[PDB]
Amino acid sequence: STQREYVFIPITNSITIDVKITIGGSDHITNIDERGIHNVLVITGYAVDEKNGRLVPTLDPCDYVKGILVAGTPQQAQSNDFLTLKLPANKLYLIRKKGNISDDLKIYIPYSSPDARNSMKTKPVSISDDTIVNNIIKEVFDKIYNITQKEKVKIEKVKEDIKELFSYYALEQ
Amino acid sequence: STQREYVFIPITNSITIDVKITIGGSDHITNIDERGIHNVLVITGYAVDEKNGRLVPTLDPCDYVKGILVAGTPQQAQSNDFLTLKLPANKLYLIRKKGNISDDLKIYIPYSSPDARNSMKTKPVSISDDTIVNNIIKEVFDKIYNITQKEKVKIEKVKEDIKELFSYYALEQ
Amino acid sequence: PYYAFAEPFFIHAITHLHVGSGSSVEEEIALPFQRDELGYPTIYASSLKGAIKSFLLKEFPDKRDVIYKVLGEDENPEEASLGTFLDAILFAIPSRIIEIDSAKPYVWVYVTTYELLKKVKLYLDSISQLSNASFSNLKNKIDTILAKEGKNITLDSDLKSAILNEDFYVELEALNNKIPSIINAGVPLLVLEDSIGREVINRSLIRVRRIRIDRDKKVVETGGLWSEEYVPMKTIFFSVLLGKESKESAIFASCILRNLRYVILGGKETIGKGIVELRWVKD
Amino acid sequence: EFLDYKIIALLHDPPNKAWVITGRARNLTQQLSRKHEKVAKYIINQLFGKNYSEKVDNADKLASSIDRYLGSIVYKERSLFENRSIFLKNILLSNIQRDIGNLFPKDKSKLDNLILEYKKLLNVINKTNLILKYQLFYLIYELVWIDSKYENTPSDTRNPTHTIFDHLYATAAMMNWILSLEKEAKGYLLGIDTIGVADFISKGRKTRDLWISSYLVSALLWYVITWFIEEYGPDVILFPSLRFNQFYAFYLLEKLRKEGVSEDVIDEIKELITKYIFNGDDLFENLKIPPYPIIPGRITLILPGLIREGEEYKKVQDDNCFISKVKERYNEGWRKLIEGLRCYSERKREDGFWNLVCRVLKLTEDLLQTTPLNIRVKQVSVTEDEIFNNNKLRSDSWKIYDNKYRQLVSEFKKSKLVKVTPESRLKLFELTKFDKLPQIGEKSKRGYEFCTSCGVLPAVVIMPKEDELEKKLIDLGIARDEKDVRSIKNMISPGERLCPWCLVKRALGAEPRLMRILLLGDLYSVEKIVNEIVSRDVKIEIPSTSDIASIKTFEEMIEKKNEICEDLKEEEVCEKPSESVLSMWQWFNKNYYNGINLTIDPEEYWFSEKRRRYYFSVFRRHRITFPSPYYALVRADSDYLGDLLEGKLTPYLAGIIDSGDYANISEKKEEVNKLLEEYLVNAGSGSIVDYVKTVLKCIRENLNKCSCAEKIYSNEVAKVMFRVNVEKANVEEEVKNSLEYFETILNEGRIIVTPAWHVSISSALNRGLLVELELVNKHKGFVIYAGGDDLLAMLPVDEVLDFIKESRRAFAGFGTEKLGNMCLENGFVRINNAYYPSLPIVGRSYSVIIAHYADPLFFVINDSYNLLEEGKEIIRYRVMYNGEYKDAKKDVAIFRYQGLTSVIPLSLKRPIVSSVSDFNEIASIIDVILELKKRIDEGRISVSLLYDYEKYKHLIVASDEKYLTEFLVKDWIKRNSLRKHVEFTIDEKLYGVRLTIENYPIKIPNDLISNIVYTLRIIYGGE
Amino acid sequence: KRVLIKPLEPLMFRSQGEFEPLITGSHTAAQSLIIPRPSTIAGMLGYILFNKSSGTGDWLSDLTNLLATIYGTFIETNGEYLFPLRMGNHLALVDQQHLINLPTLLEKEYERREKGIYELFYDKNKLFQIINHQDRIGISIDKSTRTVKEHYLYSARYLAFKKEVNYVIFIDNDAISDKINGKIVNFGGENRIAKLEVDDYKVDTSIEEEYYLALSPILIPDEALDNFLDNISDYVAMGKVDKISLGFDIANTKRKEMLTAILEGSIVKRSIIDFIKNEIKNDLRYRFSKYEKIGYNTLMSLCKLALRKILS
């Protein structure tokens, strides 16, 4: 079928654009119908390194990544460092599936080195500073799926679910 | 301080060798003492490749890999593909906690990158067919652990727990 | 305080016993015994307490108030009983022995498994170093025996081999050299592997058919046929009586429990199926 | 504007649609002047005409699988894939056809004589009520059809899977969508699920509590659908159907009594109701209510997305309109019933019990506000974006139902992951922490009491114990005099604590005619009914467990009418029937005027502790077998009927194909391929079968598409050239779509469900229910809830095995009795030439609890339900299909007697029947146990038989040759002897059958003969 | 820190209301709770620590005047740990590992998810391998006939453990630990006995995953009831919501308070936590503080041994 990619949504804004697609395929990963962020990709067991973003994998399944299957090609300048996966596409833990996927998908997934150079200890973080919620809504959320500001005159429901529908486990190492 | 190793356990006898010499290191955390295979660990989000024996991940806690934590360096001719990370031992999610926590952990993990080509129909399977399982005694449980059949006349109960304490979702393709 | 002192006692069957349970099993018996979780014969604490209380009310009619206080009150039962019985658990059952060896003649033998002794030790460990009455020797003996779980052990013997209950060959082995007998009846005890021991035990139980005859034409009435299951004579159970600190509990332990050898347990007493001798582990 | 143009949808097809097509007589042609349209036009002599441009062009091409299973034009041709024959096959089995014959309406006058009764039964309805004419005609269409001895008709002869009327009654279901889609494109699937129905029925002390609790379920769910059948016409319901519904017939003729109508034409439908919807009894008029709860407590609606309150229709104004509507209507019905009860009780401030009810109702309103039974409502939407290519239908639109239905059931399953109990809704913290509860009655010495009938809710009405009542009942607030105690003591036994809900249950049980507050609804006032009831006073006798245990005792006293009476002659047992009390218990009703007073309480006479020695002597002096204190609680639920409505195959292969096997059905391709292909190729009637089976061969082994479309086509084009007036063929599109259909069927692995499928299954469910109603009454039983798939009766311990056998056989349409007007015939249900289908594929489990009459019904009902739930999922017994010993899960009979358990497999074949042969194999093990019990009783075998099989069992289960085990059982019996020159052997299919269990506390013998003897032990143990 | 409750025999934790021969023409029956409610453990420990000069009103006042924040009970067999799991009408014991994939399992699509949970409750369930209901029928006998009284017969489904079973609680204060060590107590109904052994332990507390396992009945404050029973999908993924009664108080011989609750083994969505704090008044917060001291609102997460209160 199609190919989708790998994005974390922290208080960080460094994930603006390396997915060069604006329309993609007739199927759409995350849709929004005036109820908030839908079709959230959850990834379990991959700690984050939010500054100098390269998610070092952990072993503990008690950390998660509230990501999105970001539509398209990984810029066709990467994946010599990433990992990648062509799933039978029943395994992706997608929150509140609105449509219906025909379980056919391939996923390129960024990755990093195990970081054996300091004692690992992750921490939970939620999306603070609702103004930075709005600005990450601007940089990354707007120019991937442009139905926002198209039909959406309701931001109080689509910008304040991402408040805590996305929480992660940052290393800071 | 020491360093450990999370060797996989598939239907396959690709687990006859992981370390050069019999035991090596000073202390082990996983124990086989008269009533259970203590301190085993189950890694999630991954999968095992029974042929071409390594890891072939598939990201969901639905999938998991069950391996034992032994003290050895991986074969001295690889670890180009074997994860080598370090955690504070409380992100070490051990099943059947019995012993001592070390708090400075270092692991080697037999694994190959996914290298997506096939539709990864990842199917679980028991640890059974006793003809398969009985010859495993002194090459997976006495090739690194001479401790058994030294004091243990209790092999068949720590066989009872072998019959279940390993489980995964293989590759099959 | 709050179960300060305890009295463990042996329930020695003087006749057969039948503490009934309705039709509470899936065997071919229609009136089985009261069963443990392991399918072994047990005596519920309700039955043991009810029978002992009834007997004591009859044979100590002046001490009715002390007995009411320790074991409960019929009406105004808003006063918790300061005494309690644990479930009686099978400690040893007699078995017919065809012995091949030892030059010593035996025709019946006491038989146990290690599950039974495990539960007995559970009862026993939960008292001694917690309460104050001290009979640690019995617990040490049971621990020494439980060491050898997984092989037919003979106790205080030179048997080395026997046919048990006419149907099972077993090969025995002494414990270390010698040990005080846990029972005082001069008969060998055998502790058996939990798998052959239970076949031997469930062949030691008495399962009889019984018949109601047409009183005139001396024939069986239609459907007047059923089965019952008695625990054999000489069987031993084990229980504990736990006493909460009080004054009339001392009266119980002094005047009453020191004059209790024989009581009647279970039912079918006209058949003679209830006589029991209580031996306290205090001698 | 005025709408519901579905009277046009119900007369959509001619009455001889399969005799018009494939003409035999043809005389109707030359005496009535398109082939089947002048016929459909001469049957329209009442109301609005036809529109072949609006209804048939789309809707009928969506209601049935036949269009997709044939192809648009061959299903529409009327002329190409022909067969001069005519049959009517079962939906679940495509092997058992039916000879149809033809003495049907053949003339312009002998058919207009059907128009005569279509007239008469539609001539009291002015055009004032646009609905009531349809609301009436919809039901009795079938009734007037079959009243004339006219055999029913297949859907259409090219595919007789469906019958004439279910293909006609599933038209209007889709017509709702056709009408709400042409306007604003909103379709809906409303599903009402009642939460904790089992626990609800489990709450009660007497059988009247159970009975009216089941009736509360059925009436509180009938109230909410009263509005749906009154607004959108009748055909808004799929499960449960109403084609043979007692509740709908009752409500219908009551609505006929409305508006002012003579009691002279209502009888012309009341005869069709008492004759066919019932089976001869008219006790539902002398009871003034329907006698049994039949509403299954879980219901599916097909809605059009419209509303009223615009003085006419209007596009629905919200996504959550129906949910709020139905929840509020449910609470409304509940509070209407409780307030009507308050008023009926205030009408009787005397009689003590009614006065106590008044006195405590006023204290518990703010607690009684809450309904005692929560409901779950889920909807699913569908629009024109999904159905149409902007002018017509679509391809994969035909499957849109099988998708939305599955979405709905998926959300039902997910929401069933959390069970909330109706008691958790109440506010009691302050009422219990702070003594606020009304304690009319005694007073607890421990805060509050618990309800003895409910178990969880605190008690309001506390009754003193039976040591001295009056000297307490009067100084307390229970009673006022000595006369009123006898009436309080008549309903609330001494010691019975009652919660407000269970006390309201008792109140309703006093006279269960208050149910018309809910049974009708929307039709009469809440006070019309109270006046009607307080005017014509009628008392009902609901039987207790003591009455059921003592059935044969009563029966053996009435065959000694005075010969036993002269002995007593004094204690009102053998005295006059004073009033005209009647009841719903058929045995009580057929045996009342037979000398003995059946309304005595056995707990008073021969189950008492002050009497019963006198009564032992009385029965000893007369050859009266003294009664046993045990009765049979017989429960039964259908096997995988959920999956069956979902078109799954777990009904067809129970145990082979697990439900979990559908998650990835790619594994078990083999059995599904086999049985589905068998069914498909057999579903056809005529040369069409060749085309379909060769298509399937083109689908065989991933053969080809676009290639094998020639071999199949060199016959389809042959067929279109086999006629003289064909117009056009797009075989390119058509044969490709025809192969795509079966490809979808096999890839998914389930017959794609269309409305006709649902209405056929539901109608057959209701008809089998009507059969089982008189099967229960055939064995002196008392129905608590017999609705369609399931059953909850109480029978004597004597005829429980007989009833199990005959019921499990009648569920599969195999029987030899007439059960009223219904004479079931080998897989079908013949009703005076009408061959309605049955469920010979659906298994059925059975629970039996031999219970002492003094056993608390809470734990009895809970044990019954927990056996019938755990055991059917948890047991595996050997079966062979295709000639291979496999496992199997459902379709058993579990028995329990205070600790004894046994299981009797009922099929031993996984396509439990596939031939007309295997119809007798059903319950074959049960007649063996019945025969063996027939030998033990007469004194040809000794009950030592039941204690002597263990020794033979070792030998026989290790045994490996057939006739060896044959002789072994023959000699085991021949030590307790059965006969001189032995004649009853076990039928050699019983051996090797090994029953397994997934390691549960339910201990069971691993072999079928030991289970047979444990069933004998359990049956006897209760006698 | 950790207190192991070792039953010496079958136990009876009565699930329902009346158990006594009230009506004459009927037997009485009872069924044991698989896990003892936290009020049972609390009242037992208090009985062991009783004082004769405190409270006498609102039992949890002078009950909590002796306890620490007791953390909810689970099952340890032989060092192994089992944890309850509850569905509609269902209740299953499972171990630590089988809980990991449970959040993603309940969001698997229809057939995959139902097959998963159905295998979790009929193949992975270890209850009927370690605990089964032992039906004990008992009678009373009138001493005039030496026969049964009239219908004075009762059933009582006891709790028979096929192997060694402990009940595991965690307690904060250690002065309480070394004063209830080795105490033989009357743990449960109808006079059954269990032993208490205490061992100091170490398990972390502060964890906030998406989901949680309720190791105790989550009490709902009866002012959030309608605000809870309209939107049940927001707070529990699967389990059972039930009216319960807090037990029976001994010093005053009364039946305790009936509250709605979320039975243990139910999986709650983190939305629950603040939903309680933001919908309770300080005067009720003071009551529910004690309700949590005894152990009623205890959460474990499906990843680690994540002990967590709700209010605290």
Ligand SMILES: Nc1ncnc2c1ncn2[C@@H]1O[C@H](COP(=O)(O)OP(=O)(O)NP(=O)(O)O)[C@@H](O)[C@H]1O
């Ligand atoms: N009218 C009725 N009267 C009495 N019992 C009924 C009636 N209709 C159905 N039942 C029974 O009640 C149950 C209805 O199914 P269901 O909706 O699942 O309720 P449930 O068994 O309590 N399961 P759930 O709804 O999840 O709580 C089945 O056991 C039926 O046999």
Ligand SMILES: Nc1ncnc2c1ncn2[C@@H]1O[C@H](COP(=O)(O)OP(=O)(O)NP(=O)(O)O)[C@@H](O)[C@H]1O
């Ligand atoms: N699609 C459906 N439409 C109407 N009623 C249904 C449907 N599915 C189930 N029910 C009823 O609701 C209850 C669901 O219980 P359940 O036992 O899961 O049904 P089931 O299909 O019979 N499964 P089982 O009985 O174990 O073979 C039963 O009373 C069913 O009769």
Ligand SMILES: [Mn+2]
């Ligand atoms: Mn069913």
Ligand SMILES: [Mn+2]
């Ligand atoms: Mn079911």
Ligand SMILES: [Zn+2]
């Ligand atoms: Zn009640």
